[PDB]
Symmetry: C3
Subunit: 160 residues, 3 copies
């Protein structure tokens, strides 16, 4: 069986639909008792923002602009295609509602509760200017060598 | 005895081309190939001569009617230009005698690449099994994971 | 002991950057790294001190002249806006003294990352070996599969 397996996802994309796929896979994995690590890098870091604990305190101006102007939480992420001003996302969301397919923010709550391990790429965090306190509290800041050690120890590795 | 699993998430012509170039070559080396199509990737599996509108919601009918109807109609991931920079790629491929996507797909089907459609995507998007190629099987995410964990090479495209 | 294979399909500045951050770090940990560049990913390998238009078709000549001529010219995957939001990412990296894509590429070359160019893509897009960095080897998809199957980490970017 799959109960001792390990999966590692590098979530690079900050697209709603790619994030959804990554959490559909991670939640299903956790239900099969697979240990799941999601390493968020670049745009994927946007998945990890906690809107209730955002800040502008002691960031450069570029960092402030980036933080205020980008999606402030997972649910605000744009579609990878057909976003159409936010209308084609509105489409996908409606079709999901018809099937009772849970929204990204509910899949993310689910993944946190099932103890999917979420890591934020240190260099991406530094470049984009996010503080630890701006992300969910159980997120750990991980450098790329820690990503590689984890990925090499894993049974399934994907870049999303 | 090797095995490869590709998760085709993208519905882009060029990414689909890459996936089938790799899948066809792997079958020639006697590697067993599984392609799990999810979200936009499902569009690869549409049989245009079998399309249907019966028992679909409004958005499902609209999504069906207004997305690529078959693999050859997929857009480029880049410089598609409303079909024109896809038209560039196709001309460049013609000069080099590189087969089109639909010909790679026919080859994949003949070589018995195993094509699967992600159940949740199929349901969300409203596609029926009869609208897809006959040998496609519906598989859920847990079945994908089992198959991927048993594979020797796993990619997300 | 360990081996990593990256298939770089994307020709985006930020995706190439991710790939070379990973590749450079892997080399420091003594992991063997193979990067197979295909389709848009081939643009990473263009040597701007070498370019040629000689013995190419019209679309090949046009493609060569109009596309990014070296890694540093690659567009952002998103929010490129004229190259100005790339300008934004670049200025943010500069504040952090994060190395540029060209510096990571030079580092990768120095650390003996193995760079291969997909033969079919090369032929379609019309690039010649002489237009790419001298250590690049042209490899077909079956060589890609052999190498990926012997690797411990395999990603498609
Ligand atoms: Cl991957
Ligand atoms: Na910064
Ligand atoms: Na991937
Ligand atoms: Na539906
Ligand atoms: Na993989
Ligand atoms: Na050509």
């Amino acid at each position: 069986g799959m109960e001792n397996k390990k999966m590692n996802l590098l979530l690079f994309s900050g697209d709603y639909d790619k994030a959804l796929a990554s959490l559909i896979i991670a939640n299903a994995a956790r239900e099969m008792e697979i240990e799941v690590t999601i390493f968020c890098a670049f745009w994927g870091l946007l998945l990890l923002r906690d809107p209730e604990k955002a800040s502008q305190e002691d960031k450069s101006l570029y960092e402030q602009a980036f933080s205020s102007l980008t999606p402030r939480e997972a649910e605000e992420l744009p579609l990878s295609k057909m976003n159409l001003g936010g209308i084609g996302k509105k489409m996908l969301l409606e079709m999901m509602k018809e099937e009772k397919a849970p929204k990204l923010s509910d899949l993310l709550s689910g993944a946190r509760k099932k103890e999917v391990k979420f890591y934020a790429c240190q260099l991406s965090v530094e470049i984009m200017g996010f503080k630890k306190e701006e992300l969910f509290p159980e997120v750990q800041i991980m450098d790329v060598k820690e990503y590689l050690k984890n990925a090499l120890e894993s049974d399934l590795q994907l870049f999303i």
